[PDB]
Chains A and B, each alone.
Chain A
Amino acid sequence: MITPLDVPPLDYFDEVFTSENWMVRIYQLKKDDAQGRTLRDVGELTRSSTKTRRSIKRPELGLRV
């Protein structure tokens, strides 16, 4: 028996078909984001974060080539 707190969400694929008795699931590779950011950051952008709370910090990104 599984629970909805299991099955982590899917941020690179999206379903396009699923049969009547849920046998054959058909998924699609959704296209990479236009602004170049990774799709799990789009997924964590569009939900669950972060209760209208912020933080301002030196982003520790290294250096631009």
Chain B
Amino acid sequence: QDVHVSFPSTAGKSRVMIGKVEPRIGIDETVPTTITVEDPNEVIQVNFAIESTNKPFQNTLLIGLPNKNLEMAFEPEIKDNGKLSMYKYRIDL
């Protein structure tokens, strides 16, 4: 994560599951944008996207409504071996 790139795989697990997982791209450029992936596994719907251009010190995921100040930050699960570093966010709805 220091001198190498990384990969983010936000997984949205759900005991009660009802989701559509839409996406849009209209914002100022932060030099990191990639398309998300999908899956059809049992109770794990991984989403793969590589926006790991810049150097991380903080690495957090905010979930909620920003217009009414309802946010929730989640803890990353980083795995760095050798030169390859990866992230893992686990969201439980």
**A-B pairs under 8 A by CB, number:** 4
Interface size on A, residues (CB 8 A): 2
A65 vs B71: C-alpha distance when bound (angstroms)? 10
Total interface residues on B, CB under 8 Å, equals 3
The answer, yes or no, to whether A34 is at the interface (CB within 8 Å) is no
CB-contacts of B60-80 with A (<8 A): 70-72
Contacts of A65 in B (CB 8 A): 70
Question: Which single residue of chain B is at the shortest CB-CB distance from A65?
Answer: B70
Tell me if A63 is interfacial: C-beta within 8 Å of chain B: yes
Using a CB–CB cutoff of 8 Å, the interface residues on chain B facing chain A are 70-72
Residues of A within 8 A of B (CB): 63, 65
